Write a protein that binds this ligand. Structure first.
Ligand code: CDL
Ligand code: BCL
Ligand code: BCL
Ligand code: BPH
Ligand code: BPH
Ligand code: U10
Ligand code: U10
Ligand code: PC9
Ligand code: PC9
Ligand code: LDA
Ligand code: LDA
Ligand code: FE
Ligand code: K
Lengths: 240, 302, 281
């Protein structure tokens, strides 16, 4: 019967599809590890796929995955139990150490480029023809942490040029230096910007950028990591 | 409250983005359209430019003639009266030829001919548009995944309108152009084939349709949850995994015991969607050609 | 075992209940208080399904079906053999789903991400509860809920729909279907677009989001953008389920005749009601 053939065949196909799909999704993070970072004994029944290479634009090279995995950074954590499966306690200050929900990845310390090879994210002051078009302009608002104190003031928006969207607020601190705050982690209010994730005393510890008119992917990850980490680790100084 | 990133708090605008050039013939691109602050709360504010070469003009024109042909029949069904036109808008139907005309184009305009004319126009419209989807990818040097995925929707439509009627020996098997009339056709079809709930390809089709709602709810929710780490910048996360992609993977690893990559979720996405109409199209093509009654088939085949 | 990058995230904290008592993993799975609640509700559910099978007298998964109590029982309880098991299994189901959502909230807190996933999941749970809880309670009997069985629930869908004629004519249901179809459209396109950029023609460099925008503008004259599309997918699919729940919450309660006839309100608006010609005069 032709329909029985068609459906029997379909299942075989779908089984192969799921296999393919699952192996394609092991191109990062595998082989699996023990908690000391050595290779685990039980890797699962799906083998790692044959590698593929992405050619990256703008002379930035290639990425071949799967490949040798490696954190390329220290991880300030220690076991809290004598067996597998328990949490790992920060050995210092987790916000400073970039562990836990304050974690960052050792991405390239270069900026994301656009299609023309220009920096993707620029402060609006340096972004020809870019201006706030709708909504409350943050620039000039005082910035408030979850301790209900003022940590600083908004001095610019950092904008994605090709996608024409706001990505960070640049905030000047009491000492005159600035930091970036992810736009996704701030509430622009009529008369302030409020930052739930961080108490005012924690703003100085936001990682800083090495050149004041661009950010690197490494720098983004540290900044975004740090600020998200506050949800867990600033909670004592939070009053919500 | 935490801000949720469903709408944007502040829009910025810069110079009209005229796009990447690559191999595109720029003489076929319009100028930018207006910017919509309304859209800008949710997505991009910029409308245009659009590319419009020969195949585009052909597709659009053919598409409109399709719409012209249905609407002239509707107005005629309305007795040229605009009150009636609005009142009965959903009841009007341009029906294909009777069974008696089989597969011939020999049928009077008012009783088949017009339907064929409308279908002719749609067929040119869809296929040239399909070509457009391939050629716009080529010109930018991109993969053909879109054209391939669109081919799966075309499959179901081709089966319902052209392949299945040809195999069954008459245009009368095809679907009418009408809002209510085509719903009626769908219900009838199932009745007359012994209840499509017993067609295993129908069932799979549903598995995938629901599945697509599941996956995109998951995926969209996930990208938005990790947008504070730049998660929606998926291509750059593919090229250089960031804490966005890691937190996303790990949410799912910890919830359900396995997970995706930032490229690979898009392969689950493309296949989940595409299989809706692939399996769907098989289910219909088999119906009446090989299986008259899915209940009955079921009794005999698990 | 751990993914190569996982350890740094496996820190204590985030739990909603129990402090550090259940703050551990089993293999890849985060446990938590809600892991334990989930296991207990699911395990109990399955055992009770298994027992329902024994009393039906089958072990075949294409035949096992647990039916709600009969309409005669109202909104009261029924003997286990005769609907009670359904009722208990429904509490376990709800218990397990909600616990899974809350577990998800805990995972979110530990990972420092937003709560969008479990919020989305809540929509599914509400669709479920419409079918098994809100609608039956509003109609006055647990017997209006669907039974748990691979094929028997399909029988319920079809009987329930044909109670109101061709269900296609339910207007909330038309909106629901449109959202489902558009979502599927959206998912095809989004998957295809990102992959078309990550996997360009042979030998070429990876394309950029600028290319993705350019592609869509060239094609349709508009690009929603990479934040937009994920906002869209979420909105589309959640809207599909919202209108699915709405289209059933109204059926049997505010509207209970044949859905086709509902459209007479439009056709009979007095300004064109009596004009001759058309399909309706
Ligand atoms: C009923 C029973 C049916 C049984 C079989 C059903 C099969 C359905 C169609 C399958 C086609 C597979 C296409 C494919 O491989 O994509 C390439 C893709 C590579 O994509 P990429 O690396 O991004 O692109 C590389 C280059 O840039 C180059 O990239 P590109 O720009 O050229 O595009 C890449 C690719 C990627 O595009 C996609 O992934 C989307 C797929 C859309 C396909 C829809 C076609 C619809 C046709 C309708 C007709 C149905 C007829 C039914 C009768 O597109 C294509 O492969 C070309 C598609 C042309 C259509 C072929 C017509 C066959 C029918 O690799 C895969 O996706 C592999 C698929 C794995 C399938 C599982 C195999 C299991 C087989 C059984 C054995 C298991 C044993 C178990 C025990
Ligand atoms: C939504 C509206 C109707 C309904 C209408 C239909 C119709 C119509 C069809 C199905 C089909 C299916 N439905 Mg149903 N279904 C309903 C409610 C449910 C519920 C529920 C708890 O509310 C569940 C678990 C299911 C489950 C299922 C699967 C058996 C089958 C494939 C679905 C799928 O891929 O979804 C998308 C989800 C995924 C792709 C993820 C995978 C989920 C897996 C497959 C769920 C398996 C559940 C398992 C068999 C149930 C037992 C659990 C154990 C006891 C622990 N339905 C309600 C009453 N359903 C199809 C079928 O072929 O049935 C024979 C079909 O044609
Ligand atoms: C009483 C009715 C019958 C029934 C009869 C049928 C019939 C008959 C069919 C389906 C089909 C489907 N049904 Mg069923 N179905 C029933 C019950 C259900 C239930 C349920 C809960 O009860 C569900 C969830 C479904 C779900 C589904 C889908 C999985 C599937 C269609 C997929 C799709 O994307 O189609 C929509 C996608 C398309 C139609 C592709 C269109 C592509 C073209 C190329 C687009 C061109 C656009 C054109 C140019 C216009 C331009 C627009 C401009 C922007 C203006 N059915 C009952 C049992 N069903 C279809 C199928 O595959 O079945 C196997 C089908 O043919
Ligand atoms: C794979 C499964 C799903 C799928 C996938 C899919 N669909 C696709 C694609 C893909 C991958 C495309 O690439 C293609 C596309 O281009 O998307 C942007 C498409 C597409 N799917 C479409 C529709 C569609 N897809 C559907 C379904 C699905 N598509 C599945 C669920 C459905 C239904 C019924 O469920 C519909 C209705 C189109 C949006 C697009 C194909 C376009 C096409 O073929 O067009 C030819 C017809 C015309 C060109 C007529 C043009 C008329 C204009 C509107 C001009 C108007 C001018 C006027 C004077 C102004 C005022 C009028 C307005 C107010 C209306
Ligand atoms: C809201 C939009 C869509 C959506 C979203 C969505 N679903 C989700 C999520 C989200 C955001 C999750 O986070 C969560 C998840 O973990 O996904 C992997 C989930 C999920 N959606 C799932 C399924 C699912 N979702 C569906 C639908 C949808 N989900 C929508 C279309 C459907 C259908 C039928 O269309 C199904 C079948 C699961 C894979 C997963 C939730 C897993 C879970 O809750 O696990 C805990 C419970 C158990 C492990 C077992 C409980 C056992 C019961 C006690 C007994 C069984 C009772 C049941 C009622 C009988 C069923 C018989 C059937 C034949 C009818
Ligand atoms: C970009 O980012 C993203 C990721 O990462 C990079 C992702 O991975 C994902 C996730 C998506 C995928 C991996 C794609 C595949 C998913 C689907 C097609 C959706 C359907 C999923 C399933 C059918 C699997 C469902 C599995 C479940 C619910 C788990 C079953 C659970 C068990 C067997 C164990 C139960 C655990 C319990 C009870 C908790 C406590 C445990 C004890 C032992 C006690 C998304 C969306 C994403 O966008
Ligand atoms: C890498 O990223 C990506 C981008 O960025 C670079 C992108 O640009 C894009 C491209 C995306 C776009 C260009 C935008 C795409 C837009 C869509 C796919 C569709 C959007 C549609 C809507 C928002 C609305 C849909 C409306 C629906 C579904 C409702 C339909 C209504 C009915 C059927 C009416 C029924 C009848 C009646 C009478 C109603 C009842 C009456 C009473 C109750 C009274 C993609 C894919 C992408 O991936
Ligand atoms: C659709 C069917 C209904 C549900 C089916 C799936 C049930 C839930 C999935 C089970 C969850 C699996 C995760 C637990 C297994 C596990 O070990 O943890 C995950 C592990 C960690 O443990 P180890 O691999 O070290 O242990 C190996 C085990 N043994 C000893 C057997 C070799 O992560 C992995 O590496 C393995 C990943 C498993 C892949 C899972 Br089974 C995927 Br293929 C299931 C996909 C289900 C989706 C169905 C999609 C529908 C079709 C869509 C097509 C577009
Ligand atoms: C409907 C199926 C998909 C096809 C949709 C695409 C159809 C778009 C219709 C073409 C636009 C008509 C207006 C003429 C185009 C044009 O020439 O430029 C207008 C302007 C620029 O004017 P120029 O002064 O540069 O024109 C110079 C050319 N000469 C001098 C020769 C006239 O061009 C545009 O901005 C195009 C804007 C169209 C925006 C399109 Br309708 C987007 Br909003 C539609 C989104 C499609 C979504 C598909 C999924 C579902 C649809 C439901 C949502 C509405
Ligand atoms: C291409 C041949 C038949 C394919 C199925 C077309 C179904 C009709 C779609 C609904 C009708 C749209 N209309 C004409 C009422 O405006
Ligand atoms: C959320 C799941 C809903 C199932 C709840 C069923 C419990 C009914 C208990 C009512 C007992 C009253 N009485 C005396 C009539 O049996
Ligand atoms: Fe995505
Ligand atoms: K500027």
């Amino acid at each position: 019967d032709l329909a029985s053939l068609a459906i029997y065949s379909f299942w075989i196909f779908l089984a192969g599809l799921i296999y393919y799909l699952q192996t394609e999704n092991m191109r990062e993070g595998y082989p699996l590890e023990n908690e000391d970072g050595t290779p685990a004994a039980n890797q699962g029944p799906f083998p790692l796929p044959k590698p593929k290479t992405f050619i990256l634009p703008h002379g930035r090279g290639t990425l071949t995955v799967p490949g040798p995995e490696s954190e390329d950074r220290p991880i300030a954590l220690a076991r809290t139990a004598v067996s597998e499966g328990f949490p790992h306690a920060p050995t210092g200050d987790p916000m400073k150490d970039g562990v836990g929900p304050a974690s960052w990845v050792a991405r390239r310390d270069l900026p994301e480029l656009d299609g023309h090879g220009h920096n993707k994210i620029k402060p609006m002051k340096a972004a020809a023809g870019f201006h706030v078009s709708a909504g409350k302009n943050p620039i000039g608002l005082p910035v408030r942490g979850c301790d209900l104190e003022i940590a600083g003031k908004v001095v610019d928006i950092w904008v994605d040029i090709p996608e024409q969207m706001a990505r960070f607020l640049e905030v000047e601190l009491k000492d005159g230096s600035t930091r970036l705050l992810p736009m996704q982690m701030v509430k622009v209010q009529s008369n302030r910007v409020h930052v739930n994730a961080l108490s005012s005393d924690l703003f100085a510890g936001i990682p800083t950028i090495k050149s004041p008119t661009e950010v690197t992917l490494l720098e983004e990850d540290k900044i975004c990591g740090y600020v998200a980490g506050g949800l867990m680790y600033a909670a004592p100084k939070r009053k919500s | 409250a935490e801000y949720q990133n469903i709408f944007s708090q502040v829009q910025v605008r810069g110079p009209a983005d005229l796009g990447m050039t690559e191999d595109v013939n720029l003489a076929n691109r319009s100028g930018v359209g207006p910017f919509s602050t309304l859209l800008g709360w949710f997505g991009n504010a910029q409308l245009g430019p659009i590319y419009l070469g020969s195949l585009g003009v052909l597709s659009l024109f053919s598409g409109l003639m399709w719409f012209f042909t249905i609407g002239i029949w509707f107005w005629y069904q309305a007795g040229w009266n605009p009150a009636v036109f609005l009142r009965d808008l959903f009841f009007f139907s341009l029906e294909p030829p009777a069974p008696e005309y089989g597969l011939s184009f020999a049928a009077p305009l008012k009783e088949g001919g017009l339907w064929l004319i409308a279908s002719f126009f749609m067929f040119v419209a869809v296929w040239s548009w399909w070509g457009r989807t391939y050629l716009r990818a080529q010109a930018l040097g991109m993969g053909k995944h879109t054209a391939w995925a669109f081919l799966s929707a075309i499959w179901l439509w081709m089966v319902l309108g052209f392949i299945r009627p040809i195999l069954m020996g008459s245009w009368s098997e095809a679907v009418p152009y009408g809002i209510f009339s085509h719903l009626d056709w769908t219900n009838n079809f199932s009745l007359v084939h012994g209840n499509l709930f017993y067609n295993p390809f129908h069932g799979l089709s549903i598995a995938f349709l629901y599945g697509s709602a599941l996956l995109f709810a998951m995926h969209g929710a996930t990208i938005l949850a990790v947008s504070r780490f730049g998660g929606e910048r998926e291509l750059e996360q593919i090229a250089d995994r960031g804490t966005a992609a890691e937190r996303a993977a790990l949410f799912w690893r910890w919830t359900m015991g396995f997970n995706a990559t930032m490229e690979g979720i898009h392969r689950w996405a493309i296949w989940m969607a595409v299989l809706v109409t692939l399996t769907g199209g098989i289910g219909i093509l088999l119906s009446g050609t090989v299986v008259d009654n899915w209940y009955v088939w079921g009794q005999n085949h698990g | 075992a751990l993914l190569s990058f996982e350890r740094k995230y496996r820190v204590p904290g985030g739990t909603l209940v129990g402090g550090n008592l259940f703050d551990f993993w089993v293999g890849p799975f985060y446990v938590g208080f809600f892991g334990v609640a989930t296991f207990f509700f699911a395990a109990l559910g399955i055992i009770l399904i298994a027992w329902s099978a024994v009393l039906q007298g089958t072990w075949n998964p294409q035949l096992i079906s647990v039916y709600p109590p009969a309409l005669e029982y109202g909104l009261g309880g029924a003997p286990l053999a005769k609907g009670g098991l359904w009722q208990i299994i429904t509490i376990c189901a709800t218990g397990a789903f909600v616990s899974w959502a809350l577990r998800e909230v805990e995972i979110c807190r530990k990972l420092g991400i937003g709560y969008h996933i479990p919020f989305a999941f809540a929509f599914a749970i509400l669709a479920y509860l419409t079918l098994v809880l809100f609608r039956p309670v509003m109609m006055g009997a647990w017997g209006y809920a669907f039974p748990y069985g691979i094929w028997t629930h399909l029988d319920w869908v079809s009987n329930t729909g044909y109670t109101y004629g061709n269900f296609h004519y339910n207007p909330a249901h038309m909106i629901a279907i449109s959202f489902f179809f558009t979502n599927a459209l959206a998912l095809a396109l989004h998957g295809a677009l990102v992959l078309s950029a990550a996997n360009p023609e042979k030998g070429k460099e990876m394309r950029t989001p600028d290319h993705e925008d350019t592609f869509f503008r060239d094609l349709v004259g508009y690009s929603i953008g990479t934040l937009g599309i994920h906002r869209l997918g979420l909105l589309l699919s959640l809207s599909a389920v919202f209108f699915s729940a709405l289209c059933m919450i109204i059926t049997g309660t505010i509207w209970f005749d044949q859905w086709v006839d509902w459209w007479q309100w439009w056709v009979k608006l007095p300004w064109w009601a009596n004009i001759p010609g058309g399909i309706n005069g």
